[PDB]
Amino acid sequence: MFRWLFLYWYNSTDTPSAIAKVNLWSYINLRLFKARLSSSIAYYILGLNNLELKKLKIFYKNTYFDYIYLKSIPCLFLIIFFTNLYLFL
Amino acid sequence: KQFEERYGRAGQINISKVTYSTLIDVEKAVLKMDRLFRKVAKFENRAFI
Amino acid sequence: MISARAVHRFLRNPNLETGAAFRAGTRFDPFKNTLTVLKDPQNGRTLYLIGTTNSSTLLANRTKDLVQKEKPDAVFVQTNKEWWNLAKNIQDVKCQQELNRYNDLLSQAYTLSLDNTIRNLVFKAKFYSWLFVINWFKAFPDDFHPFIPGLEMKFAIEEANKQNIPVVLGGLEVDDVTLSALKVEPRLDPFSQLYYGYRALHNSFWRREHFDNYATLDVVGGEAYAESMDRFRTNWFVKYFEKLAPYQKKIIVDQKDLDLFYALYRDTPGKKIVAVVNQWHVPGIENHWKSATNTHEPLKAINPIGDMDINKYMESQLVNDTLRAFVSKVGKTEPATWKNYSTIYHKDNYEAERVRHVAFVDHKDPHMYHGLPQDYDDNIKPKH
Amino acid sequence: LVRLRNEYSPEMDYYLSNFHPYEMQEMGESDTTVLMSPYKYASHYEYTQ
Amino acid sequence: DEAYLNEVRQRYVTPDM
Amino acid sequence: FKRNLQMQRKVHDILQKMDRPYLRGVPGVTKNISAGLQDYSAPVSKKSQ
Amino acid sequence: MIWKYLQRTNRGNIIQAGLQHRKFENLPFKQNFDNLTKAYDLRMWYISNSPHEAKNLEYVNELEA
Amino acid sequence: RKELWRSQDALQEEELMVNENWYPKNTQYNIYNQPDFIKPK
Amino acid sequence: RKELWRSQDALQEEELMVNENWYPKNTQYNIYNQPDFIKPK
Amino acid sequence: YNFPEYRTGGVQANPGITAKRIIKCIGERLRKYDPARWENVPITFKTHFRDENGYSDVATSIQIHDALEREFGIDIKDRLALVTDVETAFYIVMSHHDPL
Amino acid sequence: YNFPEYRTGGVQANPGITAKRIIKCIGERLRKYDPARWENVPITFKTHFRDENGYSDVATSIQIHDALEREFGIDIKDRLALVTDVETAFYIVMSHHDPL
Amino acid sequence: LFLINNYKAYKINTFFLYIYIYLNNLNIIWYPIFKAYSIFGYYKSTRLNFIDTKNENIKRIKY
Secondary structure, three states: OEOOHHHHOOOOOOOHHHHHHHOOOOHHHOOOOOEOOOOOEEEEEEOOOOEEEEEEEOOOOOOOHHHHHHHHHHHHHHHHHHHHHHHHO | OHHHHHHOOOOOOOOOHHHHHHHHHHHHHHHHHHHHHHHHHHHHHHHOO | OOOOOOOOOOOOOOOOOOOOOOOOOOOOOOOOOOEEEEEEOOOOEEEEEEEEOOOOHHHHHHHHHHHHHHOOOEEEEOOOHHHHHHHHOOOOOOOHHHHHOOHHHHHOOOOOOOOOOHHHHHHHHHHHHHHHHHHHHHOOOOOOOOOOOOHHHHHHHHHHHHOOOOEEEOOOOOOHHHHHHHHHOOOOOHHHHHHHHOOOOOOHHHHHHHHHHHHHHHHOOHHHHHHOOOHHHHHHHHHHHHHHOHHHHHHHHHHHHHHHHHHHHOOOOOOOEEEEEEHHHHHHHHHHHHHHHOOOOOOOOOOOOOOOOHHHHHHHHHHHHHHHHHHHHHHOOOOOOOOOOOOOOOOOOOOOOOOOOOOOOOOOOHHHOOOOHHHOOOOOOOOO | OOOOOOOOOHHHHHOHHHOOOOOOOOOOOOOOOOOOOOOOOOOOOOOOO | OHHHHHHHHHHOOOOOO | OHHHHHHHHHHHHHHHHOOOHHHHOOEOOOEOOOOOOOOOOOOOOOOOO | OOOOOOOOOOOOOOOOOOOOHHHHOOOOOOOOHHHHHHHHHHHHHHHHHOOOHHHHHHHHHHHHO | OOOOOOOHHHHHHHHHHOOOOOOOOOOOOOOOOOOOOOOOO | OOOOOOOHHHHHHHHHHOOOOOOOOOOOOOOOOOOOOOOOO | OOOOOOOOOHHHHOHHHHHHHHHHHHHHHHHHHOHHHHOOOOOOOOOEOEOOOOEEOHHHHHHHHHHHHHHHOOOOOOOOOOOOEHHHHHHHHHHOOOOO | OOOOOOOOOHHHHOHHHHHHHHHHHHHHHHHHHOHHHHOOOOOOOOOEOEOOOOOEOHHHHHHHHHHHHHHHOOOOOOOOOOOOEHHHHHHHHHHOOOOO | OHHHHHOOOOHHHHHHHHHHHHHHOOOOOOOOOOOOOHHHHHHHHOOHHHHHHOHHHOOOOOO
16 A cells, blocks of 8 residues: 555565565556555655655645535625615615 | 564554544444344255255 | 743644644643643742633533632632622532523623713614624634633632632623723724624635634534633634734733733732633733743743754755766766756756856856866865 | 566566556456447446446 | 764665675 | 676765865854754654654 | 524534444344445445455455455 | 845845844744844834 | 833833943944944844 | 955855745745734744645745745746745745845 | 833933933934934934024924924923923923823 | 423324334435446545555665
């Protein structure tokens, strides 16, 4: 179970050489599933000695409807006020 | 096992107590349903076992 | 003269890169977020400042035990005579839920001794509208009422009466003094308050903080949320109040903190005081007490670059310069990048802007060959 | 030009990071011929029952 | 400093591969 | 492998004995401050490995 | 007043739902669609929320069955 | 001119920053816990 | 209050003025010829 | 009169002074823009401007970009990197070839 | 917290501190109002604000009156005396019964 | 609440509640995974929060 490619490929002991020395190629060890990134932006800057990994995470994705509804009340009241103001004037 | 003994754990797992309790409950429910399925299979296959 | 220590700081560990089981701190820490011990060595006085949110039974029992065993020479409770009468007429109540059942009756203690004149009626209308708006923005449930005193104050007063020690009532959050102070400031307006309160969370940070704070209040009850309110959360709440209404925050928090400090420092019997005040006055009272009695924790000077490892940067630069010179001499060429490690901010990988570092002003400039392999000897020696 | 050999030498394992992992979606036998949706066609693989 | 010199010199040690 | 190991030994020997002019510079400008390296954070738990 | 039941979000809408224990107590003595679906859902939820890989792989095999 | 221009204020500020004990000194609170801090307001 | 109000800034300023070597320190030029004058701009 | 130095690239020649300038300008900008949050927090080289969960605020970082542009006379490409800590600001400033 | 002193009349009890406050406020006001003239001139207790022939300027003195009113919280009667030197300002300030 | 408790042991009320419960659990629906990855691919998709707590991700330098 790997998240980063530099950790994935650093010291891998499940290489075909060893697995052929045992000759047992399990399906759960497919390299298609071994590594997968975090789906959050992660770029590289230059630190003091080497590359530094900086993650850019902007907004959450687990918002529920109650947050959306409570954050919309001022907008709805502004719409009501503007429409009634247009009607009166 | 030897590697974990020499170097210890990578770190602690950030979990919720609700999810912890629910994982334990799910394991117990899975064991209970496996036992029920075993009994049902034994009764169904009685004429062949 | 002025000791400009930090008073209301809610940002905890901004130098850690926290997250994913590596938290910035623990917020539960019960029995310690609430009680503070302060000393006045000049007069040999001891103060036990208890900041209550008036919502937890556990903290009420701890305060009762503290008053029982400490035996102070004075108890300073942040209530008034009307509330004390109402609460002393209430008996056989030992849990905070039962007292929460009387929340309206205890809220009757908020009595304003105002006139019936036209100006006072206009002020009453404005103040009630502003209170309604600020309670809409505060949004606390029934079981969490930090401004309606509960079992902690009642137990403190009863245990003070049992020991026959004087009790000093400091008044509720909105008392006659603060009511007159709000009368002086004409900045009360429900509509402007709504507009400014829907603009308080001007960046994502505050918004997020807001969410999780109230999120916890929605999951854990008032009793479980009173225990998990530490100094950082209290300071965040006072700053949120400041963003909602800076003038009323100045009147209700800062000025009342100064008044409570005055009362606790001078208008008290002394030599042992147990002061059960509201939760968010503890930072200001503690800061004022420490500044007046000079009992501040020792200063540990913070150099802005104290945590900067300049040696790491300079060693990396030197190592990469030596490596560039060595590789250029081996290959009989010159460096291609002069950037130690390749990152895409300059777009020099695919554009025409090089990162070559060769600067000199004339043909006699000694620093002409700095950065080039000609600067090094065949032994890769830095000079000549 | 690296001429790969039919062996399990450590030299071959050195080039293990220069290949996309082989997709398993088209492996085996498919119980759906082709998606008739024009929006998701030639890009998505067929679902399986 | 001698301690810093010791540390930085320990940074460049070729392992007995 | 052998030649690269020899070359790496040569390079590391070069890097160990090289002069470091930044150790004679002004503290806090081209060198760590005279106090040393400080940590101004207040950790609450062990950092993960 | 209005904010208590208009702005104060309910607890259930925030935290993760717990297991409904009523639906696993009295099960019919059959390997029917209901019981098989309950087992499949239990194991899928477990592997979706469990840091334990051995039990997760056991549940993966049982989920395929 | 041939030398890139630097304002006298900037040169003085760099000269002050050469010192190891430099801190901004213009903050409202004593955030760096400096023993020689005088509140500027 | 019974004590006439003095702002903390005013009290600090008087405390500073108690010193004999006090000078404004906010001038643009070194008009008092003080050896420890740093131009504030 | 103090004659400015002829040799260019002095920002890269004094990493400590560059970090001090970055810290000063960032601190002033953050205390002006968000006084309720940064007026009590000392800003050092390891101080970051993200949440406790690593989520960054674009408004604060753009304020920091403006402060760095005005302090060093540079044009920070906001679409390429976002300054979320003093280390990132140091990297951006020292990477630019015309800081002063 | 530094408690203000109970005893009144502290301005008259510290002639040196009163003169220092007068000098500071007058200097600031004169450098703001007339920078081309007073930005180089040190203002001490014997400094006067008249011409070399003893002729006084009403505008400068009214500026000084405003500065003294704002500094000490007093109301200087401009029609009774004109502040043309630091000594006159000292006399006016110490004569008032409510300076603070 | 007192009235509801009082009419809890009545057979007719219990029959209505039993019909309600039976209709509630009548329709149990199974949602399969119809992608070729199937169970193991989905399981590997749900490992993000726990990858960093594993021995192969511990900092372990060869030299």
